[PDB]
């Protein structure tokens with residue numbers, strides 16, 4: 001099979017932390033794939049805790065670094081017609097949204113496709129067209145955005161319906177690890193020049209959900225899906241009907257009421273201790289993502305952490321949680 005791949009990304013210090021002359025309690029060694037955490041009191045004499053992962057990215061890591069090393073190869077596996085999922089897990093403030101979506105460079109310096117602050121989602125969407133136009137390709141791309149807040153479901157892309165309309169989920173008669181979500185719109189991305197405006201209506205729906213729901217950005221989970229239908233007409237006339245799906249999953253903040261977050265953890269524990277009963281059905285998140293958790297999807301986790309000492313307790317919690325998950329076997 002294939003173990004879940006787990007990478008760590010430490011955010012850099014911000015303006016205020018630099019101004020307070022903050023010293024990092026985290027040391028990342030990408031060559032050894034190690035993160036070392038200062039856990040005791042002192043700085044010239046110190047107990048430390050180290051963890052090995054599949055990859056480690058320190059505070060210096062840029063969006064392009066993450067894209068080249070992590071996204072690209074997974075996108076290739078999607079294009080070869082397989083299912084893949086990437087989770088972002090970590091405490092609020094550590095760069096889950098930064099990693100998955102990214103931000104705009106200030107002062108209108110760049111356009112969306114060349115912005116260095118762009119995260120996984122736009123980079124993926126751009127590259128799918130850039131690579132698939134390049135070869136002989138009859139292909140189609142569809143996106144959806146399903147969000148979970150308090151075990152209720154929301155479509156954050158659909159220009160027709162408004163965000164406050166809850167959706168309903170049902171089991172899928174013709175798919176065992178699968179569900180049907182009534183009212184979730186899949187949107188056809190016809191070409192690379194439709195991408196941004198589709199994202200923009202999403203960004204607007206996000207603001208309304210934040211107005212409607214308490215701490216929505218921290219307590220919600222989003223599942224951004226992109227589906228590629230391929231019948232590549234290369235240069236021979238060949239065409240094999242392959243379908244690839246990519247779920248980009250921005251989890252609710254892990255910091256110490258959230259049934260989906262509680263159930264993800266118990267599912268992970270069941271899977272790693274190989275308990276016969278895995279409680280998938282105990283939350284919306286784990287039903288929707290059942291195949292990503294010990295199923296037939298290639299799954300990666302990006303665990304985000306802080307360099308600051310103030311965050312020590314939550315950083316260790318994140319590291320231990322993520323480390324456990326390396327033992328999950330997928331197919």
Ligand SMILES: Nc1ncnc2c1ncn2[C@@H]1O[C@H](COP(=O)(O)OP(=O)(O)O)[C@@H](O)[C@H]1O
Pocket residue numbers: 010011012061090091092093094095096097098099103304
């Ligand atoms: N790798 C990074 N590089 C630069 N800034 C970052 C990084 N990770 C997080 N940040 C910053 O930290 C703050 C919180 O990041 P955000 O993506 O909102 O985290 P989360 O979604 O996990 O709460 C933002 O100001 C963001 O710019």
Ligand SMILES: CCN(CC)C(=O)c1c(NC(=O)c2cccs2)sc2c1CC(C)(C)CC2
Pocket residue numbers: 100101102103104105111112113115117118119121122145156196198199200201202203206224
């Ligand atoms: C600038 C605001 N934007 C882009 C519309 C985003 O916040 C955003 C994303 N950002 C981006 O697409 C980019 C950042 C920098 C260059 S392009 S990806 C994404 C959203 C919102 C969402 C609800 C549609 C989910 C996926």
Ligand SMILES: [Mg+2]
Pocket residue numbers: 096097098217218
């Ligand atoms: Mg966030």
